[PDB]
User: Fold this.
Amino acid sequence: DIELTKKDGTVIKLSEYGFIVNDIVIDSMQINTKYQDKENMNGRILMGSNYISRDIVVPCFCKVKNRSDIAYMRDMLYSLTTDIEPMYLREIRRKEELNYRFTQPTSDDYVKLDKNNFPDYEYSRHDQQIYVNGKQYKVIFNGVINPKQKGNKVSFELKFETTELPYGESIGTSLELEENKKVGLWSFDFNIDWHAGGDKRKYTFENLSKGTVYYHGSAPNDQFNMYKKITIILGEDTESFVWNLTHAEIMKIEGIKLKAGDRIVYDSFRVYKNGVEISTETNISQPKFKYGANKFEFNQTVQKVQFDLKFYYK
Amino acid sequence: GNYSGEETFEHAGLVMEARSALAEIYGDIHAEPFKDGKVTDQETMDKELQSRLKKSLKQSLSLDFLVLRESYPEADPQPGDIVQIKSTKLGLNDLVRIVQVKTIRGINNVIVKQDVTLGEFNREQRYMKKVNTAANYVSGLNDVNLSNPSKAAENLKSKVASIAKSTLDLMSRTDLI
Assistant:
């Protein structure tokens, strides 16, 4: 219940700004269907079906000490939130409906009050809220009205909306999973084994014709807009270079001659032959990680493969 | 079609009239005759003639096609192929040929829908090509003058008849000598 927003150049959270929130409700993704009805047949063909948009709603109110200040506070809200600038929203929850604790009415152990006139139930460090999950959402704002209930309390009804892709982009790459350097950004929503360096954590293999990958993301990383990015030290010289993959298509690189120690950066629908001067004419096919086991099969025992990606959720 | 270039109607050159099998119930009609021709033999004069006939009772089937991917994938339509259509409650089981196809492909080269036309490409497109041919043949010329046209054509034609008159005079004057 804070509605964190990471904008291009800053980080903001509402309750820091005197802005309590009632709740956050996140719709699912609007499935746009594409059916076609045959003329006299009791059944209609599916041309397609496709996720579109994940409309968020967040009603937030605010109290202040005096009626004038309402105006300022409201303006702050707009200047703080209503941003066409695609932002990264992060949801927050509490772990408990906190109450005031027992005290002693002996002219001592009195109660605290926040900067806003409320009772601080958060006595200890471990009371305040948490990033409930290690993911974000690429988000933009839609129109709000501000009904002023009595006093200094005024409500607002934010209506956020997904920007590019209706998915729960996981923050942090898969290499931070590999190297346990960055802390946070890994919630139990992702069923992740502790065996760092073990299987289903590793995306850095060496000297293999074929290997195994566990894509922890329920949603499939077929869309190029996702940050799926591979880089391979090819290991062995060749004239052509095929690699296959399951839950995806076959990939070739024919017609250009390579060398062993040369490396390929295989970005989404894009191929850096040696990091620059992209040679992407050969078999334009992009790979697709669906969920769980995504087994790959090279053909000449690359001396290194490693690939970072982002986990996406539905 | 065998009269010489300078005659134009003294109908030498394989005078004939043909007809198709359906004629006998419909009866006496006829199209623009094969007037223009420098072709000697008669084998030609029946083939081209029946072709002028059978090209005209026109049938354009501008149906719509909808691709099934999970099922029936082996139907990538390509123009200039044979196909066996059959519509119940229409009186139709014959086979035809594609003459137009219209594909769309969003991404990954997956098809969304197809449109096709059979036999003759359309009535529609025939009209439109007629219009555009008129509008481009015109404006490629230079003799056109919208304010009182036909000066450019009548000047020419009267010049032609005048030189023919002078040639008649020359003919008489030479036959004199």
